[PDB]
Every structure is written in structure tokens, then in C-alpha cells.
From Swiss-Prot:
Protein name: Azurin
Highest classification ranks of the organism: Bacteria, Pseudomonadati, Pseudomonadota, Gammaproteobacteria, Pseudomonadales
Highest rank taxon of the organism: Bacteria
GO molecular function: copper ion binding; electron transfer activity; identical protein binding; transition metal ion binding; zinc ion binding
Described purpose of this protein according to its UniProt entry: Transfers electrons from cytochrome c551 to cytochrome oxidase.
Gene: azu
UniProt KW keywords: Copper, Disulfide bond, Electron transport, Metal-binding, Periplasm, Signal, Transport
Native source organism of the sequence: Pseudomonas aeruginosa (strain ATCC 15692 / DSM 22644 / CIP 104116 / JCM 14847 / LMG 12228 / 1C / PRS 101 / PAO1)
Keyword Nuclease in record: no
Protein residues bound to Cu cation: H46, D112, H117, I121
GO cellular component: periplasmic space; plasma membrane
InterPro entries: Azurin, BlueCu_1, BlueCu_1_BS, Cu-binding_ET, Cupredoxin
Length: 128
């Protein structure tokens, strides 16, 4: 099975998927984030951040507190299972993480922690 997904986020504050399936036979999984807009990361930054569903709100709220210089993530946030960097227009970042961090049955969400953006950029991730 494939073990990677390509995701883009634009200047219009949306991602091109709200649902990712990670096949249980994958040992690692990769997400390739790109930003086809024209606006820079201080104005229209996007990241891809993964946590349990239960943990999403806190990661988003603490990340907003932390500011651009932290990529809008609380330092040392152990709720964050995996994430990309925060990227702007014309940039790309990939993250590859161990599928051993995920369990069949548990409920996960991916999301963008740039202020306001999780209102529209978020989705489920499932191990299947
Ligand atoms: Cu495979
Ligand atoms: Cu964003």
C-alpha cells in the first residue's frame, strides 16, 4: 500500500484533503505539504500537525499563544504526534513518522495551528 500523501494549503485558507487513511502495513508514513499561494508564512502560514482528537483544541490554543517564531506550536508539546514546519508561499516541507505511534481504533486529527486556520483546515487521520 502507499505510505505517503501530498497536501497543499493555499492563500484562501484551505487544505485539499480533510481525511487521511494510513494503511496499517506501513512502517513509516509521509506527508508532503506545499503552499501554492503568493502570501508569506507570517500572513498565510500553514503547517500539518497531528494529535489525538482529544488533544487538538489544546495544541491549537497553546500554539496560537506561542507565536510565529515558535511556528505556532508550544515548545516541547508532547501531544504533537508528528508535524511539518510552518511554510509560506512557494515552499514545501515533508514529515515522515513512525506508524508505531498510531493504534487501530484510536481517533486522530490533523490540523494547521496558524491563528484562525484550524476553523477550516483540519481533518481526520485513521489507521486501517
Ligand atoms: Cu505498501
Ligand atoms: Cu494555515
Amino acid at each position: 500500500a502507499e505510505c505517503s500523501v501530498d497536501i497543499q494549503g493555499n492563500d484562501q485558507m484551505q487544505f485539499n484533503t480533510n481525511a487521511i487513511t494510513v494503511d496499517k502495513s506501513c512502517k513509516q508514513f509521509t506527508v508532503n505539504l506545499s503552499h501554492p499561494g503568493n502570501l508569506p508564512k507570517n500572513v498565510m502560514g500553514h503547517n500539518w500537525v497531528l494529535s489525538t482528537a482529544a488533544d487538538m483544541q489544546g495544541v491549537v490554543t497553546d500554539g496560537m499563544a506561542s507565536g510565529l517564531d515558535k511556528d505556532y506550536l508550544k515548545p516541547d508539546d508532547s501531544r504533537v504526534i508528528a508535524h511539518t514546519k510552518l511554510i509560506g508561499s512557494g515552499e514545501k516541507d515533508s514529515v515522515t513518522f513512525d506508524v508505531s505511534k498510531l493504534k487501530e481504533g484510536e481517533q486522530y486529527m490533523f490540523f494547521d495551528t496558524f491563528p484562525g486556520h484550524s476553523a477550516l483546515i483540519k481533518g481526520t487521520l485513521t489507521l486501517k
